[PDB]
Design a protein around this nucleic acid. Structure first.
Lengths: 20, 354, 73, 89, 76, 75, 93, 74, 76, 74
DNA sequence: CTGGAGACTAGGGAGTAATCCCCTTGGCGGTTAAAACGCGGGGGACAGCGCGTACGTGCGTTTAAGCGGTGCTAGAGCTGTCTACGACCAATTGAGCGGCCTCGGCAC
DNA sequence: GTGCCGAGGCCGCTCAATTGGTCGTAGACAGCTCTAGCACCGCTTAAACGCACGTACGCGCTGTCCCCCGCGTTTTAACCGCCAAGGGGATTACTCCCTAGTCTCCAG
């Protein structure tokens, strides 16, 4: 089964990165 | 959300490179256009099923382009269709009042030298901005259908041009690792963004030809306030990222959201503004937009720094293009494996529209 | 216009082309292909001048258009 | 008498189309594109050379097709076939 | 679907490669890609030869028509 | 070169649309067969030495039909 | 490893057609050779571009010929003797 | 030293499009010499053709005719 | 002063002519001039392919040498 | 036909061409190049004589053939 | 690792198609009278190009220390070949019947 | 200036002498090819630099210009003898449809 992620305002594992 | 991967071939299993949703549509059922290496642009009818699943209904096929088509776009009014291919020409299709609907060529925007990559539109509906492998961005008048402005300051292949919705500036990114932003009124380059400093050395903001994809389509905000640019690298080794700039200053990004591993290539914003549910720009409205990288799709909004949605492991090849729908209920993605995918959201899932 | 491409001129061009005898209406047709050629070789050539941001057509741009066509001379 | 003409013309190289008619043809065909255009005399020379070379080659291979069909004369069918096989249309 | 047997074409490209240089192997995907390309080339040449034969109001193909189409195409 | 069968050329020409086929064309096709490869393969090796590999890839044929100006759709 | 950069350069260049001998130094060289031949002579920009394209094609073709010459001599590196033999076998000088 | 304006990496790129791997350091002078000879042999013919036209300027068409005399028209 | 045997080259050129167009006339002066042209071409090819062979520190001449000479001259 | 150009003939031709030592397959590659050279000169001479309406072939046509090829010899 | 049905080879059958001739009607090559547009050459300086310069800026060249792919150079190692010769072996000259198409010479 | 005519010039083919030319055999050995090891000299960033390169810009010269005209060579065109593109007919040639074998490349 394919995996979808919907609208949230398990998602915590996919944070984008800055650079200091 | 829901994601449906089309297991049938749209362009005889050839890779799909461009999509667009009919912005002129004001209802719930949508019309889409797909461009493929089959030298054809196919207009399909996309509608959610009774269970909520997207259904694709073929409507028409356009074979006027001599060679493979790279970029296809619609006008803001939805009545004017611009198709770009490997023939270095732009075909203008209008309503003609195996195909179910009829499309007719009205204008032939000759004046491109090399492969065309990205086609940009104007809010007034009277202006074209187009980018090609000719290292040049060409600006045209619809009422005359002839070339009126030329920007040949790119030293390498141009893969994206975006027009400001307010109608003052235009942003072009080429393969020379240079971001050139021009004043449309002055018809001269105004801003150059190629090098950026972290912490105190300065390195290139963008990265060279190792992309396996053919598009670097950066986007303007529908309100024009922000510029979102993919295919960036940040030295933290280097990691892939997408940079955010504001109209206040176009030279330096305070924030970039990274995609370690594969590099982001296409970005597209929804035409529907939502009420507010770290923030890049602070106004009581918000906008939802999405970026297609090599093998994943990310979905952000105005406020959240981290992605609102993350969808991965769908296609077997590099994703080519992403296109939002008129009402925001559909998000069409195409890869270079010959098949496409759709992201469908329930009513007001992204938020409450303004 | 096209009638500048003169019938004895096509005669002599065919003679250098090695044609012994020309049918009477080839003249009414060959000029046609000339347009089909010209409306291409000129067509991109001017854009090249537009691409070089000059409004004068030059022999180098024409040679480039021929190179794209594949009949360089 | 014709063979004399072919020999004496294949010997030479000078331009075949009259200068001014070709120049005015080029200018008229550029007029429909967009007005206020400047063509250098060298550019018109290049156009004349290209057009004459194209027609020399096309008439050579249409004569080839005609001699194929056991006809010394060349007919429009020869022009269409030498255009299609070459890939022009 | 293809109308040329895989093994003869494979062995002939192998011997021509040996005539070029030894130990130049071939992989399957390249083998079918080249076979498809040669398929299209030959079928296009045959279509042009059909047209050329139609010119001479004889339906049959003659050996020359092939060489005439070749030399018009500017190959040799 | 005899591996290219007579029925192969026959149905090739039949797909081309012809009705009648001679005999002398057959070997002739083999001729025009090999010379085609007799160019393409060289470019392949002209790329294979560039590729520094011993087994050719799918990019070699793409570049071959790009150089010869006869690019073909499909794989 | 050494060599891959050369292959990447070949891929970048053979596909491409841009300029390699830079415009201004070639203009200076053409002007100097013109003054050597006869003074007070003017070279159009398109004329210099055409001349530089001809120069480009001649040198790339002669370098291809000298590559064939060096490959025949069973060595990858070129040498001036290869160039001399390529010129003589071409009948130029 | 005007002929020296043709840099070493420029000749190297010229070689790369020529399809070679290792360029010897002794070839730069020889290639500069042959290039100057070729430019001389084409400039003389272009100049004679331009003077035949009674013009005070050589155009892009004249050098094309000079190359046609040479045999590598382009 | 010629080294190609005269009788044999005359028959060879007649047989070549019969391939192009049958019933063709060849005179002694034309055949002698053709012999001179062929001898000049072959002597030039042998001399400069000998140079190409001595380039590779070899004294003999193999088919690759003549092939390279012809390829460089532009005849292939 | 071609076998009239015998091995000792090409041997003495090579000796007067300047090469001292000769291999085996040149004996056939030289016949091949001789055929390729003769075909063009014969074709163009036949065309010129057809232009002159001559079954014969004047030596003037032969020297013009060489001039077209580039190996003129009286 | 072993098996067997779709495909390649020859052939009878003849039948459809390529080839060559027969007016034959049409239409395409001289040709002469002329004129008419083409080639050429003379100005005006208005308005447009390339030259040349200053600035910057930054992409690209230049040097060096550095190392390793590679030229080549010495030493086998096997191998075709140019030596002499002895056999064939095409064959040049010396003559022809017999000609016919061509090319220079001569006369009207 | 051109048509006829004579006369040589390749034909084209034998019919032989002897005659230089070619082929095949034997192999000692000069040389192609291979192998290996050395030094040496082209590929690689760091840093300096430096010079293409772009953009504007005052100054200035060579594309150039249409009008007449000078003329004048070439194009239009109608007449007309004459070649040829073509339909039809008969003739000879060469692939379709099994028939059978077979064979071998693909499949379990």
């Amino acid at each position: 089964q394919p995996v979808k992620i919907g609208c949230v305002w398990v998602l915590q594992q996919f944070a984008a990165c800055f650079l200091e | 959300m829901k994601v449906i991967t089309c297991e049938i071939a749209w362009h005889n299993k050839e890779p799909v490179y461009s999509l667009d949703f009919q912005h002129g549509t004001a209802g719930r059922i949508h019309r889409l256009a797909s461009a493929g290496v089959d030298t054809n642009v196919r207009i399909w009818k996309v509608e959610k099923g009774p269970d909520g699943k997207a259904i694709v209904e073929f409507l028409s096929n356009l074979a006027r382009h001599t060679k493979a088509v790279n970029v296809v776009r619609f006008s803001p009014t939805g009545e004017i269709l611009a198709s770009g291919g490997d023939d270095a020409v732009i075909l203008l299709w209008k309503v003609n009042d195996l195909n179910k609907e009829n499309w007719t060529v009205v204008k032939t925007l000759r004046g491109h030298l090399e492969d065309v990559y990205d086609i940009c539109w104007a809010t007034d509906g009277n202006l074209m901005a187009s980018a090609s492998v000719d290292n040049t961005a060409i600006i045209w008048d619809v009422s005359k259908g002839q070339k009126i402005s030329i920007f040949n300051e790119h030293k390498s292949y141009v893969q994206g041009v975006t027009w400001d919705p307010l109608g003052q500036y235009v942003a072009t990114l080429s393969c020379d690792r240079v971001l050139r932003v021009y004043s449309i009124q002055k018809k001269r380059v105004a801003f150059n963004v190629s090098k950026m400093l972290s912490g105190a050395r300065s390195y290139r903001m963008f990265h060279d030809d190792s992309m396996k994809s053919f598009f670097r389509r950066l986007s303007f905000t529908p309100d024009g306030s922000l510029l979102l640019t993919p295919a960036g690298c940040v030295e933290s080794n280097v990691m892939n990222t997408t940079y955010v700039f504001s109209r206040k200053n176009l030279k330096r990004p305070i924030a970039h959201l990274p995609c370690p591993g594969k590099a982001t290539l296409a970005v597209r914003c929804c035409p529907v503004y939502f009420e507010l549910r770290v923030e890049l720009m602070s106004l009581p409205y918000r906008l939802v937009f999405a970026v297609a990288s090599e093998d994943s799709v990310l979905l952000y909004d105005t406020q959240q720094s981290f992605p609102f949605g993350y969808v991965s492991n769908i296609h077997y090849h590099t994703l080519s293009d992403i296109s939002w729908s008129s009402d925001g209920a559909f998000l069409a993605i195409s890869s270079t494996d010959g098949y496409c995918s759709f992201v469908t959201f329930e009513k007001d899932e992204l938020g409450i529209p303004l | 216009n096209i009638q500048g491409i003169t019938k004895p001129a096509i005669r002599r061009l065919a003679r250098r082309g090695g044609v012994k005898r020309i049918s009477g209406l080839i003249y009414e047709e060959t000029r046609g292909v000339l347009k089909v050629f010209l409306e291409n070789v000129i067509r991109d050539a001017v854009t090249y001048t537009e691409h070089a941001k000059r409004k004068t057509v030059t022999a180098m741009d024409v040679v480039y258009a021929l190179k794209r066509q594949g009949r360089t001379l | 008498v014709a063979l004399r003409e072919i020999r004496r013309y294949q010997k030479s190289t000078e331009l075949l189309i009259r200068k001014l008619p070709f120049q005015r043809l080029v200018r008229e065909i550029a007029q429909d594109f967009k007005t206020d255009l400047r063509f250098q005399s060298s550019a018109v020379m290049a156009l004349q050379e290209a057009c004459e070379a194209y027609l020399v080659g096309l008439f050579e291979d249409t004569n080839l097709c005609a001699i194929h069909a056991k006809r010394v004369t060349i007919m429009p069918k020869d022009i269409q076939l030498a255009r299609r096989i070459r890939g022009e249309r």
